Short mmCIF file of C-alpha atoms and ligand atoms in Angstrom, two decimals:
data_model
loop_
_atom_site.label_atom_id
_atom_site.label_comp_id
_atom_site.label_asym_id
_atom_site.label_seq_id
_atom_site.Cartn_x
_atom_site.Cartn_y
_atom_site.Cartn_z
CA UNK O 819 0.48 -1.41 -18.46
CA UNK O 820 2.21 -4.20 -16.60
CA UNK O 821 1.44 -5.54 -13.29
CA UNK O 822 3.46 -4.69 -10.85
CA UNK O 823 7.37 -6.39 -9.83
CA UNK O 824 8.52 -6.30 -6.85
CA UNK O 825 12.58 -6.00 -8.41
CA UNK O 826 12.07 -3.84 -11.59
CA UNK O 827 10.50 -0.75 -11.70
CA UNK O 828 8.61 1.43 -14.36
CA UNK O 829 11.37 0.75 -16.49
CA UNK O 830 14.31 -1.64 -16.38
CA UNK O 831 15.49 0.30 -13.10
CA UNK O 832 15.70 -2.40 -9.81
CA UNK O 833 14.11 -1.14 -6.76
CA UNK O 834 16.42 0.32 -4.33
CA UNK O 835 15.66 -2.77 -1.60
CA UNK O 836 16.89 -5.55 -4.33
CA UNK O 837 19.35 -3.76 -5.65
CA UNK O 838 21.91 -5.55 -3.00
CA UNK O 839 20.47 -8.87 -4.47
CA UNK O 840 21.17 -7.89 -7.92
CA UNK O 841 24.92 -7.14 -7.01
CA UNK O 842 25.19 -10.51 -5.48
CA UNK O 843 23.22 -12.17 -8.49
CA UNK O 844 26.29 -10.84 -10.77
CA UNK O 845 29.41 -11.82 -8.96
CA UNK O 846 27.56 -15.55 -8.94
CA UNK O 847 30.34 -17.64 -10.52
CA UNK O 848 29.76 -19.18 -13.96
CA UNK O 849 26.08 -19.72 -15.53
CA UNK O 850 24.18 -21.00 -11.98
CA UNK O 851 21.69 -18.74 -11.71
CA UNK O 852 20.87 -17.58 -14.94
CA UNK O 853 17.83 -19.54 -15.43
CA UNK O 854 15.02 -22.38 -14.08
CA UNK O 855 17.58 -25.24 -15.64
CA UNK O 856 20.81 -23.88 -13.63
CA UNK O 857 18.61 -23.09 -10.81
CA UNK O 858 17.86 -26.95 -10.60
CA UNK O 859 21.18 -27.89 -11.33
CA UNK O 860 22.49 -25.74 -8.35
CA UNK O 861 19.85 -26.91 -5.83
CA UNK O 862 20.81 -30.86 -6.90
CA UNK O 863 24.52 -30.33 -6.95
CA UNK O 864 24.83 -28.49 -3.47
CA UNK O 865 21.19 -30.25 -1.63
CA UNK O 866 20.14 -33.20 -3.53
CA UNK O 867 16.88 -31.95 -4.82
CA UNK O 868 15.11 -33.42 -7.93
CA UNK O 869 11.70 -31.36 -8.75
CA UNK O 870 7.53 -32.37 -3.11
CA UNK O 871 6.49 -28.58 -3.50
CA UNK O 872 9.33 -26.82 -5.97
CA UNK O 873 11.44 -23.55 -4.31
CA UNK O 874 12.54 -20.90 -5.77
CA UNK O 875 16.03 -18.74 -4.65
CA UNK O 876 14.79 -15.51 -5.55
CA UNK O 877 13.39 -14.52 -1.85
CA UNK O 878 10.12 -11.86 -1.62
CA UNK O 879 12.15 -9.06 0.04
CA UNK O 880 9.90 -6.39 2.75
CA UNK O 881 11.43 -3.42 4.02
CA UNK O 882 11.29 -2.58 7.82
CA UNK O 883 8.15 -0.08 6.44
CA UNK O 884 6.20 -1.88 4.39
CA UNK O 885 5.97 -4.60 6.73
CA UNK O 886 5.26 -2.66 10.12
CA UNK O 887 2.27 -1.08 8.26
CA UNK O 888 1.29 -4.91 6.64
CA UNK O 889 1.66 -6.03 10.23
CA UNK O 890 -0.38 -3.25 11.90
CA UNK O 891 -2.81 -3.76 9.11
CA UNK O 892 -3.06 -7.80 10.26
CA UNK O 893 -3.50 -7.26 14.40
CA UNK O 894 -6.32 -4.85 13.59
CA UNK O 895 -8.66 -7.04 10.96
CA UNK O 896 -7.12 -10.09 13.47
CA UNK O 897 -8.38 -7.98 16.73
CA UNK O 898 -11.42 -7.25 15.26
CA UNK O 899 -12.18 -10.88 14.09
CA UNK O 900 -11.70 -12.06 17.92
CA UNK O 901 -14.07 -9.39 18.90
CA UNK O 902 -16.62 -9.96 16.49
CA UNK O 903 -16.24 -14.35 17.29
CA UNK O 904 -16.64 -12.92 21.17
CA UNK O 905 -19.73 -10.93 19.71
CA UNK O 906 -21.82 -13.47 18.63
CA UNK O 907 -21.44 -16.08 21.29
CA UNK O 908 -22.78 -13.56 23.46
CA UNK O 909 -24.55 -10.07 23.19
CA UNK O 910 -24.42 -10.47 19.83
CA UNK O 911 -24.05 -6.27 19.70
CA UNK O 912 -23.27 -5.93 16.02
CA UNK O 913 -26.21 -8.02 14.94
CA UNK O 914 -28.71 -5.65 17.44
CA UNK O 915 -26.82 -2.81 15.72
CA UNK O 916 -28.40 -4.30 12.27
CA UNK O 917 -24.35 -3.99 11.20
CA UNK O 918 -24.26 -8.10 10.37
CA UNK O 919 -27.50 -9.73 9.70
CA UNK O 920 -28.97 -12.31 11.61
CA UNK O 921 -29.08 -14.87 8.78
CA UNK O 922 -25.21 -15.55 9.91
CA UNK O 923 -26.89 -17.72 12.93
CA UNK O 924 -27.92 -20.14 9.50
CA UNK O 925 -24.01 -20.84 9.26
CA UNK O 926 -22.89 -24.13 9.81
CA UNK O 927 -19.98 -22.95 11.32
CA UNK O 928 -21.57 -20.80 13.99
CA UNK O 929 -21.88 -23.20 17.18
CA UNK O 930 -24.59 -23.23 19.16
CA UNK O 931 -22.49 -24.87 21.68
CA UNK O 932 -20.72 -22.10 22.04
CA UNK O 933 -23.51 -19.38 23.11
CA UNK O 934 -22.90 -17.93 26.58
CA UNK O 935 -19.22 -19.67 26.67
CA UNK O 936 -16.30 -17.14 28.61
CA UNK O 937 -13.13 -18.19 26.24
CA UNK O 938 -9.34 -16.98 28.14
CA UNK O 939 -8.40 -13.63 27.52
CA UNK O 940 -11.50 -13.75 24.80
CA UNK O 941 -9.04 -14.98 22.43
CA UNK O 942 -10.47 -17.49 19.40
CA UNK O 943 -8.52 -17.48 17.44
CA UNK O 944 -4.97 -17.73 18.86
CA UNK O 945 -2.97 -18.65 15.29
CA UNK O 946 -4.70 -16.29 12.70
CA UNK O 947 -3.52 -17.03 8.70
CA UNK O 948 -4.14 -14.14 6.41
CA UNK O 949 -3.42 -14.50 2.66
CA UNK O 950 -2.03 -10.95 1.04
CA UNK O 951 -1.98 -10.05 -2.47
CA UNK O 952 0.06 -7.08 -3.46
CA UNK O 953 -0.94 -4.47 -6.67
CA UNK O 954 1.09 -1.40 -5.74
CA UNK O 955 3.95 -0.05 -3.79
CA UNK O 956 1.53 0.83 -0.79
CA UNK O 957 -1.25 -1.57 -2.03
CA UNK O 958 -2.26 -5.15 -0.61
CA UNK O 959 -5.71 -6.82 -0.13
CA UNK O 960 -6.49 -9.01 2.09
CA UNK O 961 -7.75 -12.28 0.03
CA UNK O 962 -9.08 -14.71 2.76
CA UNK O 963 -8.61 -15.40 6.62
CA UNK O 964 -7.63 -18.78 7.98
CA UNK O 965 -8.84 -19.21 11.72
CA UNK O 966 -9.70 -22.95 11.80
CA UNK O 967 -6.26 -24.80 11.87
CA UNK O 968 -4.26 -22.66 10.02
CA UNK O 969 -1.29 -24.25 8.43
CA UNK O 970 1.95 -23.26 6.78
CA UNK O 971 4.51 -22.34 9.04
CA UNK O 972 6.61 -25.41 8.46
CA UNK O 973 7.33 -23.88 5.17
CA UNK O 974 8.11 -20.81 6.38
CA UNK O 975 10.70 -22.25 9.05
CA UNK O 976 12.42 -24.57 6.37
CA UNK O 977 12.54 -21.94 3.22
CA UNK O 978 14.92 -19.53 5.72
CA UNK O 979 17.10 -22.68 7.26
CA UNK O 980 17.21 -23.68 3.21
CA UNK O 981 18.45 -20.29 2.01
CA UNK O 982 20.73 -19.92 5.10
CA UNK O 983 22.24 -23.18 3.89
CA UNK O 984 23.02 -22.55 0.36
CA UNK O 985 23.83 -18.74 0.39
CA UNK O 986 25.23 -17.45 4.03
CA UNK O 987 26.95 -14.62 2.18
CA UNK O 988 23.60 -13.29 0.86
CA UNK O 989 22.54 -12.78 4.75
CA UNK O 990 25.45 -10.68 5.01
CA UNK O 991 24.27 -8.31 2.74
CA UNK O 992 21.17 -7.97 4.13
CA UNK O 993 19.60 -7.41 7.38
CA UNK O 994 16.79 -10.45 7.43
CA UNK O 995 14.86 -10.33 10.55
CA UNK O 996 15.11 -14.12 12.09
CA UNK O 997 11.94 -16.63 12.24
CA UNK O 998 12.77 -19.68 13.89
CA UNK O 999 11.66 -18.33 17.12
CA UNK O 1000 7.91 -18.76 16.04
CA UNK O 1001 6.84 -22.52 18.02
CA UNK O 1002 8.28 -20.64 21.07
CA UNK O 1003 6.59 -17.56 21.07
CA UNK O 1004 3.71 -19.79 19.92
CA UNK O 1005 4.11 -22.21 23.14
CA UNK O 1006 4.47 -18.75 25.45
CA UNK O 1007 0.86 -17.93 23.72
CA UNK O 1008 -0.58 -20.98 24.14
CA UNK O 1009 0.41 -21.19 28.14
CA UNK O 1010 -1.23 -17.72 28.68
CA UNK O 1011 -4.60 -18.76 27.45
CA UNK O 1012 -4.28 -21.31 30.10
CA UNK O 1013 -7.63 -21.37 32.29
CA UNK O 1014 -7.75 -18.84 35.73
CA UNK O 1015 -6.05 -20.63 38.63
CA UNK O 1016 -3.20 -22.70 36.55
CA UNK O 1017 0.09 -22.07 37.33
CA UNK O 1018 2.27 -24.23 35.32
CA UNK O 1019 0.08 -25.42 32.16
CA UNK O 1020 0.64 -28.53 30.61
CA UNK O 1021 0.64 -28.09 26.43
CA UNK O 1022 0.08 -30.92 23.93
CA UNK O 1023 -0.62 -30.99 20.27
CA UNK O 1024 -3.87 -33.02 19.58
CA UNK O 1025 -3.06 -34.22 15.87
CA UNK O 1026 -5.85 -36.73 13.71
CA UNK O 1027 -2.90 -39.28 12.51
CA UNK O 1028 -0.29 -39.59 10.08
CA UNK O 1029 -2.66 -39.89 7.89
CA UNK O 1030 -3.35 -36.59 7.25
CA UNK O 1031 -1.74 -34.03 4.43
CA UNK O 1032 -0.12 -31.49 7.54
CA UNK O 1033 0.95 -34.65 9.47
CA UNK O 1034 4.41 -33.78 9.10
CA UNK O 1035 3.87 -29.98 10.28
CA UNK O 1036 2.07 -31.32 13.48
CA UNK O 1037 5.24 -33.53 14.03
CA UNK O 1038 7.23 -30.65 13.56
CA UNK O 1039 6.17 -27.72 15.14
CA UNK O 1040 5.48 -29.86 18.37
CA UNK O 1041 9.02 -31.13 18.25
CA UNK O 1042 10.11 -27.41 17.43
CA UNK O 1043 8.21 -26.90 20.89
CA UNK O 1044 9.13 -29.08 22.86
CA UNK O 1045 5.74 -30.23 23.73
CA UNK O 1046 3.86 -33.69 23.66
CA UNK O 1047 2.22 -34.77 19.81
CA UNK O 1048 -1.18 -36.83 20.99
CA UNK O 1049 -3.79 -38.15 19.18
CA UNK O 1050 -7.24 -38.60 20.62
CA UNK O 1051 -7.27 -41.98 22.34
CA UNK O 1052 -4.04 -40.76 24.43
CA UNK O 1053 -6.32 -38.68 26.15
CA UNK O 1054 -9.35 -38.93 28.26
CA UNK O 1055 -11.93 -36.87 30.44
CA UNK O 1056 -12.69 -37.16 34.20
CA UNK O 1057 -14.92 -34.51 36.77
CA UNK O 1058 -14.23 -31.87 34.56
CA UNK O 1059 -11.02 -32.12 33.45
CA UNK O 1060 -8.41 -33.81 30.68
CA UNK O 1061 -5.66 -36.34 31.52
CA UNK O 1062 -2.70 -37.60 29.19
CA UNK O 1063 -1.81 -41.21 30.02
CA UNK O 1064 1.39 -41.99 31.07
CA UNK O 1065 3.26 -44.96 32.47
CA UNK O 1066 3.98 -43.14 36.16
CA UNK O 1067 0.21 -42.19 36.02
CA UNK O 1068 -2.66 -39.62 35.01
CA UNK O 1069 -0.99 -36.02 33.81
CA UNK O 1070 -3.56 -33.65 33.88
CA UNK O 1071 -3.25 -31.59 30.15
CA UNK O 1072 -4.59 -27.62 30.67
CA UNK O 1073 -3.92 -26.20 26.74
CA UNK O 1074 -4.75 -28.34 23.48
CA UNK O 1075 -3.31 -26.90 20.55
CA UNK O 1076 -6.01 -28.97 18.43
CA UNK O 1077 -5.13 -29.59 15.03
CA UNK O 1078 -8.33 -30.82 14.34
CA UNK O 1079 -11.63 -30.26 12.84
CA UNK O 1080 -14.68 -28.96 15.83
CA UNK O 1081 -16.57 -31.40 13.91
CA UNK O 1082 -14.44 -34.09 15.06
CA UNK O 1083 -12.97 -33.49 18.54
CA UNK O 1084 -16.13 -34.83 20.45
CA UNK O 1085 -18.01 -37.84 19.67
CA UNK O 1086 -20.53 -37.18 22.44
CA UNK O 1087 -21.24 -33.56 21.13
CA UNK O 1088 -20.34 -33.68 17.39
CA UNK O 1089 -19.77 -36.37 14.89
CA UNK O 1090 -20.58 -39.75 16.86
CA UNK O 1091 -18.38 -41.59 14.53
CA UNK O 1092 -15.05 -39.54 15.01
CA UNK O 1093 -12.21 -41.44 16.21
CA UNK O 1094 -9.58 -38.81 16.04
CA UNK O 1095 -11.15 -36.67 18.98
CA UNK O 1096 -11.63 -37.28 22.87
CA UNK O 1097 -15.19 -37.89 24.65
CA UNK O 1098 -16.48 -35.24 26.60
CA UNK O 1099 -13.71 -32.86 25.71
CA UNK O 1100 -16.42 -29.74 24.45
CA UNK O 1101 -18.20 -30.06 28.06
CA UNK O 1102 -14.61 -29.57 29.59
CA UNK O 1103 -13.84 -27.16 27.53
CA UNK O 1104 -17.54 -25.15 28.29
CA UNK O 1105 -16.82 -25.47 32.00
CA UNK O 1106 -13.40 -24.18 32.22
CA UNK O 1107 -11.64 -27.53 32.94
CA UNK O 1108 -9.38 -27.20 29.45
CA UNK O 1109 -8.29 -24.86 27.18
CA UNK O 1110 -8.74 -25.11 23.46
CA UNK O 1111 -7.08 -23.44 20.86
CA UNK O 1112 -7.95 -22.37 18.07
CA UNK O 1113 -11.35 -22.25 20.32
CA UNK O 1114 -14.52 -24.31 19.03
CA UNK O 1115 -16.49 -22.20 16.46
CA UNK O 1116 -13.93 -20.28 14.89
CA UNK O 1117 -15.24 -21.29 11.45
CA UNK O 1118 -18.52 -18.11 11.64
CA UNK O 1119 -15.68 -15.68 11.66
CA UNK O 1120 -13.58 -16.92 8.31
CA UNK O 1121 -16.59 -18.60 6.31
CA UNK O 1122 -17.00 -17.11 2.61
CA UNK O 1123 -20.03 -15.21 4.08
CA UNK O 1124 -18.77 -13.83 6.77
CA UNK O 1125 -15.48 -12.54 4.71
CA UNK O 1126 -17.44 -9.46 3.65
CA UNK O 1127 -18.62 -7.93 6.72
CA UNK O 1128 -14.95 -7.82 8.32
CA UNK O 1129 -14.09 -4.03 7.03
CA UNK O 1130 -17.46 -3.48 9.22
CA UNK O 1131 -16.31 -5.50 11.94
CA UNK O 1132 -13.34 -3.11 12.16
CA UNK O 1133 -15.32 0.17 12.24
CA UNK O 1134 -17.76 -1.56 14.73
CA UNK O 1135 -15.03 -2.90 17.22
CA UNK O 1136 -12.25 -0.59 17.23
CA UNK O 1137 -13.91 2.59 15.93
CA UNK O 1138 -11.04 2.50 13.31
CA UNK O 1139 -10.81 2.55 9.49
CA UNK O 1140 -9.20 -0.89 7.87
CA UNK O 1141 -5.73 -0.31 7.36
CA UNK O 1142 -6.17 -3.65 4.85
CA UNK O 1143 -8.70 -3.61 2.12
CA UNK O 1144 -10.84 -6.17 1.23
CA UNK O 1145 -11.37 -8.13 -2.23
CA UNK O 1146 -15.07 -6.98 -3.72
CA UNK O 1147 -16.23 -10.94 -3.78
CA UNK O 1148 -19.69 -11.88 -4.99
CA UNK O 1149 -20.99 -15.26 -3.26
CA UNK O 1150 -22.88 -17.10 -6.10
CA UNK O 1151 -24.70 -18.87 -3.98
CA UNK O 1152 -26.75 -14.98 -4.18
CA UNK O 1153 -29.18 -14.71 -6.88
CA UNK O 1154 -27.79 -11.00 -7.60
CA UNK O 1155 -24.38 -12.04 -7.45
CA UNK O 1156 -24.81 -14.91 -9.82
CA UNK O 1157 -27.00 -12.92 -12.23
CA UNK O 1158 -24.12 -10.23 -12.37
CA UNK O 1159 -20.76 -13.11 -12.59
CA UNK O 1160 -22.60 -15.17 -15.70
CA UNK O 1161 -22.81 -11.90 -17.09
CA UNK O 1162 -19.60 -10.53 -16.66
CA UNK O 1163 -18.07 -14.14 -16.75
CA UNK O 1164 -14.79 -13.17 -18.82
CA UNK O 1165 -13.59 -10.37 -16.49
CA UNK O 1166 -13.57 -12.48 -13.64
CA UNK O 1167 -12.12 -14.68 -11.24
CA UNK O 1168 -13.88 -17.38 -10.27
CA UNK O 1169 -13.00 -20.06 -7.42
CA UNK O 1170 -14.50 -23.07 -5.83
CA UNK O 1171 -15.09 -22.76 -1.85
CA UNK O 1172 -14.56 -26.61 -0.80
CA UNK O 1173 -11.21 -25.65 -10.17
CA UNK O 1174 -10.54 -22.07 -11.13
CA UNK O 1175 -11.42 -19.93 -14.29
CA UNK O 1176 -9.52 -16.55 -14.96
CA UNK O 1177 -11.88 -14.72 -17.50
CA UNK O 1178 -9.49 -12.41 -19.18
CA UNK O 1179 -7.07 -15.62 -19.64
CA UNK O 1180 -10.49 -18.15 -21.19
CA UNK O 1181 -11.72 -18.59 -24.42
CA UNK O 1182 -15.76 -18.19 -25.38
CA UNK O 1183 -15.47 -21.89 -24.91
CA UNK O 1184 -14.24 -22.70 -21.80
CA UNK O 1185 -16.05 -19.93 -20.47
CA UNK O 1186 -19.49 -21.60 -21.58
CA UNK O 1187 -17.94 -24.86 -20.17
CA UNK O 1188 -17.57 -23.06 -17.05
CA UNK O 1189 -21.05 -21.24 -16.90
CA UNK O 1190 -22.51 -24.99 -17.05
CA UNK O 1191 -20.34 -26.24 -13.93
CA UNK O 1192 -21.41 -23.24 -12.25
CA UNK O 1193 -24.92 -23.82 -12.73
CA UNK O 1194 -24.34 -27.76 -11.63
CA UNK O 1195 -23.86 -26.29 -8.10
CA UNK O 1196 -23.82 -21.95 -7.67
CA UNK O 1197 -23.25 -22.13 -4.20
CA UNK O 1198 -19.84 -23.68 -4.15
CA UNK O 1199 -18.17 -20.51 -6.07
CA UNK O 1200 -17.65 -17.40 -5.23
CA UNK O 1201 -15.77 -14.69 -7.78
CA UNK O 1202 -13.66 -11.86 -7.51
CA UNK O 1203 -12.64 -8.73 -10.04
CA UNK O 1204 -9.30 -9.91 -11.95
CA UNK O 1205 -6.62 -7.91 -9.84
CA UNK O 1206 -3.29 -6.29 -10.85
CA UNK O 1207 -1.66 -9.63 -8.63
CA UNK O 1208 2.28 -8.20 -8.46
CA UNK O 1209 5.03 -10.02 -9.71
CA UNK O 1210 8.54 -11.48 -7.75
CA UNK O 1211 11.54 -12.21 -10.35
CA UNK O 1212 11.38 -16.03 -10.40
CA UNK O 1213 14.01 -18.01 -12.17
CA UNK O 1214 12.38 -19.67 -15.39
CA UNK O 1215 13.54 -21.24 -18.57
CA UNK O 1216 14.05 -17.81 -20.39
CA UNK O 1217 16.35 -16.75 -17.30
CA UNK O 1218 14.63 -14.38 -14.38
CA UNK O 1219 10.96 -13.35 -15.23
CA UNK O 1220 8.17 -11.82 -13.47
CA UNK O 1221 6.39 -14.53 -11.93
CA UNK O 1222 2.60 -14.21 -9.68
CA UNK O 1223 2.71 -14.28 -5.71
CA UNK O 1224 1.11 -14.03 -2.23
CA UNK O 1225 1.55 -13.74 0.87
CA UNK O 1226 0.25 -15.54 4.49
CA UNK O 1227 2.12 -14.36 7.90
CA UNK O 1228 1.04 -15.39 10.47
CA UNK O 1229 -0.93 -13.83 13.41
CA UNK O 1230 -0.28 -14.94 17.18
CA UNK O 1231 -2.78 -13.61 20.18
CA UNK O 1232 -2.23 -14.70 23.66
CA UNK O 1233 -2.08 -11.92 26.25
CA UNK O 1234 -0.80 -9.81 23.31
CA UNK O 1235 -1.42 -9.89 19.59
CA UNK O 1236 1.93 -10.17 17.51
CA UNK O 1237 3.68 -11.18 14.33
CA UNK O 1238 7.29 -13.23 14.03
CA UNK O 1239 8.69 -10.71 11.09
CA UNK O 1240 8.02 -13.51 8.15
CA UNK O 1241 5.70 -15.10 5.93
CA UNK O 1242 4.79 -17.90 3.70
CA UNK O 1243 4.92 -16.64 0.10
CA UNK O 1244 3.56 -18.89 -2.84
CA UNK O 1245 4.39 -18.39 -6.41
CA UNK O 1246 2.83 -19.21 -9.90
CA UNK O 1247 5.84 -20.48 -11.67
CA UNK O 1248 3.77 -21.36 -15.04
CA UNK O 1249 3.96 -17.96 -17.40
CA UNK O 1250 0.65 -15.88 -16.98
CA UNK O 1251 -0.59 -18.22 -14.19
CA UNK O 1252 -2.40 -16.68 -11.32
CA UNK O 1253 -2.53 -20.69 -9.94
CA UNK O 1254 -0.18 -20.13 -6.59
CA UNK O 1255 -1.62 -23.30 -5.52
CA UNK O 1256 1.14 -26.55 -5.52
CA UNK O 1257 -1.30 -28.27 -7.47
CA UNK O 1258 -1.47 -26.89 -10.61
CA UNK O 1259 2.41 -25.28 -11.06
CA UNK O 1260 2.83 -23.87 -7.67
CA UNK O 1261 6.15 -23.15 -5.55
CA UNK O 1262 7.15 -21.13 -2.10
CA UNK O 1263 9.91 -18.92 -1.68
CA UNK O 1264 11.74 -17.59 1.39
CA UNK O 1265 10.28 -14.12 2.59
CA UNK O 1266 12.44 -11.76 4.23
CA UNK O 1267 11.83 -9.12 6.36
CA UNK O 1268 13.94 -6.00 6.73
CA UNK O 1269 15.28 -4.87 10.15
CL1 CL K 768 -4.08 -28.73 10.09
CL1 CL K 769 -15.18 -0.71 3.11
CL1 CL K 770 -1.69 -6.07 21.77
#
């Protein structure tokens, strides 16, 4: 019992969609992609590179099946998650319905501010993120959703341009759906949500500064739209609306793409001390003067707590059974929950909210050691049963072994709710690691999509 690869099948066979990519992989000339060592030695010869987050040539190959029923799977928990954020700033139907209970309106992340507030085309969250994990050939579970500023699709754009680069022939062979349309369809989303009566929106990217980690990716996907990169003190608010200053004058702005924390877009409404954000921009915002997006309050809808009620949400909302399965995760901030996880400690997976121990992979040791961090402060964890995580041949020092992955496309909703046909996929190069994270031996590879 092996987990399962997404080349090699229940024996040394290759799956029929990589068995093009093998074929290639043979005629290679000489020794260059035989291993991790040759792999590096390629990528510096040819681009320079000396391993910034490490990439890997093998690309996570979909079929045109696989992902139409990954992507139908994603605009349904996404639809739902706009309807339920639409929910409770206003009727608040599912909580009436005793479906979600009311101790949700103790969330942090639920604004107030919000209550009562008519959003365009009831749309929230207009960039959705939703990390995939893969155990089967028709089996993925949705890990977490990311509808606050998700991030990632710089990464996506420059893992295809990279691959295009170094192997056009590979391309050849297969029919990749393209990407690099994404900050377009993403600007044509953004205009739509612009606020009844506008005719010609103005866009602009409200960013916090350079110095911040996804900088570059604000820099970048602004430039890849063509629209204007601002931070908060190029703006300012006037009888109910937002203006960009400019030498000729005043230009009125109608969308933000805020790349920004609520917490800190609004000194007069949230934290006083914030210098990244623009004064009086949540009252515009309330009285239909601006449009914000991802909208303010997002955070209810993709907080740890929330995360288990969205199968619900589905059946609630749409009438509809989850295409996408959730992960059973206990919240050990729960008595119950953290009873049963100390107890069951070595079969487990458990993670920090805002350090990671894999059970089956600890010692009696470092599972004590672990027991008495968790007890330092229960509510910041939260654990999951150890899943069959698939495998993507990755080039390591042995040559080409099964190596851990996931998957986040990408989910865009303006006046209709869509995916570009790719993905950012993140791989545990270290052997047995189920770390995807850059931090601690993670990499991205290039995900294709079938046609
Ligand atoms: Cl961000
Ligand atoms: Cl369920
Ligand atoms: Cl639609």
């Amino acid at each position: 019992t092996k987990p399962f690869d997404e080349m090699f099948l229940q024996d040394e066979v290759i799956r029929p969609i990589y068995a093009e990519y093998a074929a290639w992989l043979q005629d290679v000339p000489h020794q260059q992609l035989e291993s991790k060592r040759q792999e590096a030695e390629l990528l510096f010869r040819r681009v320079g590179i000396t391993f910034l987050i490490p990439f890997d040539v093998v690309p996570r190959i979909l079929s045109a099946s696989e992902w139409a029923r990954l992507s139908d799977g994603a605009i349904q928990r996404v639809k739902a998650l706009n309807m339920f954020l639409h929910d409770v700033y206003h009727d608040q139907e599912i909580i009436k319905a005793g479906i979600v209970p009311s101790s949700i309106l103790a969330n942090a992340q639920y604004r107030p501010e919000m209550f009562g507030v008519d959003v365009p085309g009831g749309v929230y969250a207009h960039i959705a993120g939703v990390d995939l994990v893969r155990t089967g050939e028709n089996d993925f579970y949705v890990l977490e959703d990311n509808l606050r500023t998700p991030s990632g699709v710089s990464y996506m754009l420059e893992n295809r341009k990279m691959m295009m680069r170094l192997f056009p022939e590979l391309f050849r062979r297969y029919p990749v759906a393209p990407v690099e349309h994404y900050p377009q369809v993403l600007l044509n989303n953004l205009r739509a949500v612009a606020q009844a009566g506008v005719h010609e929106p103005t866009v602009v990217l409200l960013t916090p500064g350079a110095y911040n980690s996804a900088y570059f990716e604000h820099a970048f996907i602004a430039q890849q739209m063509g629209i204007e990169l601002v931070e908060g003190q190029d703006l300012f608010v006037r009888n109910n609306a937002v203006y960009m200053r400019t030498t000729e004058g005043p230009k009125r702005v109608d969308v933000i793409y805020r790349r920004i924390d609520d917490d800190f877009i609004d000194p007069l409404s949230f934290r006083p001390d914030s210098m990244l954000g623009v004064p009086g921009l949540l009252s515009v915002y309330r009285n239909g003067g601006v449009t914000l997006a991802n909208a303010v309050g997002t955070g209810v809808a993709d907080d740890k707590d929330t995360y288990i009620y969205v199968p619900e949400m589905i059946r609630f909302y749409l009438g509809e059974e989850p295409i996408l399965s959730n992960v059973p995760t206990y919240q050990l901030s729960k008595a119950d929950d953290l009873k049963y996880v100390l107890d069951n400690l070595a079969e487990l997976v458990v993670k920090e909210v805002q350090g990671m121990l894999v059970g089956p992979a600890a010692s009696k040791q470092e599972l004590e050691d672990f027991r008495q961090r968790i007890l330092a402060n229960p509510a910041n964890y939260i654990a999951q049963p150890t899943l069959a995580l698939s495998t993507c041949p990755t080039l390591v020092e042995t040559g080409i072994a099964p190596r851990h992955v996931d998957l986040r496309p990408f989910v865009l909703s303006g006046k209709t709710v869509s995916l570009v046909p790719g993905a950012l996929c993140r791989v545990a190069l270290r052997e047995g690691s189920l770390v995807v994270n850059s931090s601690q031996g993670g990499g991205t590879k290039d995900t294709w999509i079938l046609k």
